[PDB]
């Protein structure tokens, strides 16, 4: 575990911790899951927090986030792939990638989107398959 990795996870933790108070509530986990096209129930959101929770106090703080991010898998990558692959055809098109990305809080122009695809696209078909997705994650 390197100072550089610790730093990245910290910057990652921030994006979940909206109010910047230093805790992830189910309220903020719910904001994240929803902009990823999911609709978890308040008890599903509570189940996900117990997965990280060490105290039993209902919130994730940074040391608990780090424990988890560090402890860690094929199941979770496929699960992430599915968030992007909305029509379930096994390829992430530029429309689908743009769609997910704006929901998270960007507006990319078509050239920004195509740049990102070009970066991921090994076989040059202009869409991201699963092999290529592991590579970018």
């Amino acid at each position: 575990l390197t100072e550089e990795q610790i730093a990245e996870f910290k910057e990652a933790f921030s994006l979940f911790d909206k109010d910047g108070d230093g805790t992830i509530t189910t309220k903020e986990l719910g904001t994240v899951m929803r902009s990823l096209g999911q609709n978890p129930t308040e008890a599903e959101l509570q189940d996900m927090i117990n997965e990280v929770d060490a105290d039993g106090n209902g919130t994730i703080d940074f040391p608990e986030f780090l424990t988890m991010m560090a402890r860690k898998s094929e199941e979770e990558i496929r699960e992430a792939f599915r968030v992007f692959d909305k029509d379930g055809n096994g390829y992430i098109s530029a429309a689908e990638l743009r769609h997910v990305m704006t929901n998270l809080g960007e507006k990319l122009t078509d050239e920004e989107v195509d740049e990102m695809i070009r970066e991921a696209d090994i076989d040059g078909d202009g869409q991201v398959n699963y092999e290529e997705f592991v590579q970018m994650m």
Partner: peptide, 17 residues
């Protein structure tokens, strides 16, 4: 489950900067 969101977000941060 929760880790998938974690890596989508890591990718997302990695992409904003």
């Amino acid at each position: 489950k929760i880790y998938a969101a974690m890596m989508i977000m890591e990718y997302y941060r990695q992409s904003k900067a």
